[PDB]
Design a protein around this nucleic acid. Sequence first.
DNA 1: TTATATTAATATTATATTTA
RNA 2: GUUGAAACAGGGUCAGCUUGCCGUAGGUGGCAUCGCCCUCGUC
Lengths: 124, 124, 116, 124, 283, 283
Amino acid sequence: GLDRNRQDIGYVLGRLFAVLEKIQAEANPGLNATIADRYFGSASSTPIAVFGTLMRLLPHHLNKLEFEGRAVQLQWEIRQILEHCQRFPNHLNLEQQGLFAIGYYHETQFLFTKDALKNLFNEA
Amino acid sequence: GLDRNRQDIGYVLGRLFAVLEKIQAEANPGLNATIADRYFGSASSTPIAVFGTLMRLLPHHLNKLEFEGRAVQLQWEIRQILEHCQRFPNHLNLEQQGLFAIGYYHETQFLFTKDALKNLFNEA
Amino acid sequence: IGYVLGRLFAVLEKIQAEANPGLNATIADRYFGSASSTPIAVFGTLMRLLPHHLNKLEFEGRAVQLQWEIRQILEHCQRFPNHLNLEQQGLFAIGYYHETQFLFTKDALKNLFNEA
Amino acid sequence: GLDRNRQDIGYVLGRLFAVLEKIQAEANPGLNATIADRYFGSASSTPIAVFGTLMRLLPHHLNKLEFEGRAVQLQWEIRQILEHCQRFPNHLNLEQQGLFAIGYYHETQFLFTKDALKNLFNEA
Amino acid sequence: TIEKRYDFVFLFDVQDGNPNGDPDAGNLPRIDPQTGEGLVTDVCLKRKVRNFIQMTQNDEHHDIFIREKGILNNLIDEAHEQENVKGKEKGEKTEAARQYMCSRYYDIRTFGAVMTTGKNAGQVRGPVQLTFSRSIDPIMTLEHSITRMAVTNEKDASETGDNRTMGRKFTVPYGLYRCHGFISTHFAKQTGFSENDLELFWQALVNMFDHDHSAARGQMNARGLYVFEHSNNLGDAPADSLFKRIQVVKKDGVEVVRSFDDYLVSVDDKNLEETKLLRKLGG
Amino acid sequence: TIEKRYDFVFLFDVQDGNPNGDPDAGNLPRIDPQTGEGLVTDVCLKRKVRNFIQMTQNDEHHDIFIREKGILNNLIDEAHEQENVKGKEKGEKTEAARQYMCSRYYDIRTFGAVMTTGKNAGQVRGPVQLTFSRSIDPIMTLEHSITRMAVTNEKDASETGDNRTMGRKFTVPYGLYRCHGFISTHFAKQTGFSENDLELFWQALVNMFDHDHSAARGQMNARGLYVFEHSNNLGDAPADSLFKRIQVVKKDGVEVVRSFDDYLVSVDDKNLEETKLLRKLGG
DNA sequence: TTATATTAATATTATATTTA
RNA sequence: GUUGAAACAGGGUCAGCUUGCCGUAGGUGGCAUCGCCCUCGUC
């Protein structure tokens, strides 16, 4: 249940936010306010607002990732997502509004399915 | 009485809304207007309208969940539902109109059956 | 698929009549002619009225009980049918009366809820 | 998923930063704080701040590149990027804010796609 | 009376509103459930044509068999207080009453009327028979929950001062309903339904929605009235082999419609001219 | 009563705010699902008119079916305490009560009223019939999460070190809703809705947003009120062919709209001059 | 005619592509 | 081959004729993202 080549900017941004929070929640798993808890509200609606800051904020999570290769694992799928994101849309369309939540939970599943990211990375 | 792999977008959105309100009603059980009481009318008919906002609104409920692992429990089945939701449909079809209420109450049963979610999560 | 929707209509109208004691247009008087014979036309919209009726139940525990039994009713339902055969609109009526005299039983819903 | 001729100053700077960190991470792959980890926060927002220093810092990475022709490979695409950068903007526009992260990960993909840079260089 | 038989396709749309609420279904628009396509009863359009004729004609020979305080047996008993009080011999008293109710009431002359009820006025079939109007595409009935800052009887008034009765406003965000209709000549002979009454009906079909507006209808229009006038009193061609000439489809790339500009109404008047006219009265 | 059938395009925008809170089934600006175009119920604008008339007239013959303390059957059973106490013979008693609360309530004269509730007082068809205002371009509802420095209930979740109740302020960053409305002279005969009542209605549509301001709805304005005054009681031309005159589009290159300067409201009164008056009251 | 009070609620996943 | 036989439900008859689901109704009223945090320590 993840269309890795969907190209729906809402869906690719949802996927991107899912991996962003996956990294944040693997950077420090004990986290009061993940970017879902603090950024999702606009990441789903105003991707330009956060997703700029979400990637100020991303390399530092990739650093904080304990398993230094896991950082490559997750950064690679950030790039895989962002190939489909020619631009962070100013305001997510309403279709795209919902598809962002779709993407968050699709890509979150893809990340929490056991071998998926580590596998799918190894076919690149 | 829950077809977890139904793929009927109305039914998966009903399931999704059921778990969304389950989280809201476990976030703060003392709640005047759950998302059933404020969002269901269109979630059943115009899923793009709310279900975007329902998931602005979701990570904050997952935070407010007292049992931090229960948040993972419910978020996991949100993802399980959303694998079956390739998109929040603009307007739910009439078949899907009814299947949304079906999904709400099927998944609400599945959540209020004692061990079901905690079990079914542990087979993932 | 007709009897369980009759039960669903019975609980829905009980919840409404439990929410609004004095109603001029119960969802019977307003939605029955098409919930009996054409469940997708209606039960997709009865059950948007439903969360509001449950909200308005003065005993929120009673709202939980009635929502529990409508979950049970609707667990037997996999989809509201487009049209109810003449066989099942009789079931709907029978299902309606069965469930509505189950609800108006002494402690039936409180009991059945408490054995879950 | 890389618009090599995008001309969006945010996107070209993101591409430029992606190749800058590619060089840094090929200069010494064992690197505690790549320029993503130390410069990205402002490179995405205040390109004049770093991108001056990023290119004090660039010829030295090109020197430290073990494969002396790989240095030409990466410097060539730095120039390819910088044709599209008439100036490092003082503050990246918000659209451009996000497009910088887009560029970082688009060009990072383009660099970590196997033959792309070595190929695309050979058509110049 | 008319000497041609007509089969008309009356495409009318609703933009944001309840074209015909199903009393069986709250008030949400009538819908062909197993296809989701909307429905607008024939009686609904006959009603709005009645409202149009009651609006415009305002004269005897075009009454409407009428609005709320319209005890129909009163009008029927008016028929039996006529030239046929006694002189028409109860057997054909009802037939003379039919001829009257047809003369006076354009409703009865045009559509039929079950007037066998009071001082029995017979049973008029009605030359004009609109069918049900099945929308071309599934109407996506929106069911706009609305609010009222006021309540009704001080029994539903709030236990605090805050009275409100939110209620529900079902709207079709767009539906191009397609009503097939039949001006049958054989019953025009029965009712005296004339080409004047028929032109009244065509005006009524085109203009029946410009005038019957509600908070419920929102905005309904008459997107086309393609009338197939046969040469004969009989049908030159089968009625549905004609109605298939008015093929209304959602246009090339619309997921689902939101305006008449989302429907292509292709009219195929290529070969119907065998002996027969197609007049595009409304579209 | 009025004698000319007005059909008006009432364009109104919301500069940053919740135009019509929203479906109540949800509370993010009432949208058309497919298009994402915002909706504003006809009853929302009717309420803006009602509030404008209620603040402005403050007069008998212009009451409203008022706010919170608005038990409508109180105001209806008040109608059964006039010249029609009971001497109006229940059949026409409801009609006399209906005429009384038409005369008394500018609301009811202008917009209808389901008064068949208390001591049943007829139903009014409401000459003025606004439709669902649907925004020209998809409203890009911003859904601004706001906070409160104060929890509402002394609930279990009014915790120790801070009482906050985040809450959400849905807002349309901009949306130029379009409200086709129809003023039917035939139904203004049934209420006494007068040319002065109608001038009040236009004054209301123009000025009613400058007064019904709120935190929720932000700034919201009457960007245009292009009325088409038909020469006669009937329709001088089909309503939609007139509303196509007021064609509202985004400007040349604005991908998204931020203000009325992002909307070409092209208006062509070229051939309506036949017998329509395009009275551009609001803009 | 009747009836009219809260079920369920504790963590998924997690180790490096590209580099003439 | 002496013992209940033979045997019609027939023939046929539009359920019609027709009837607005309605009139109409604010989602509202309103709510701080906050309080604050050396990019450092140094070559």
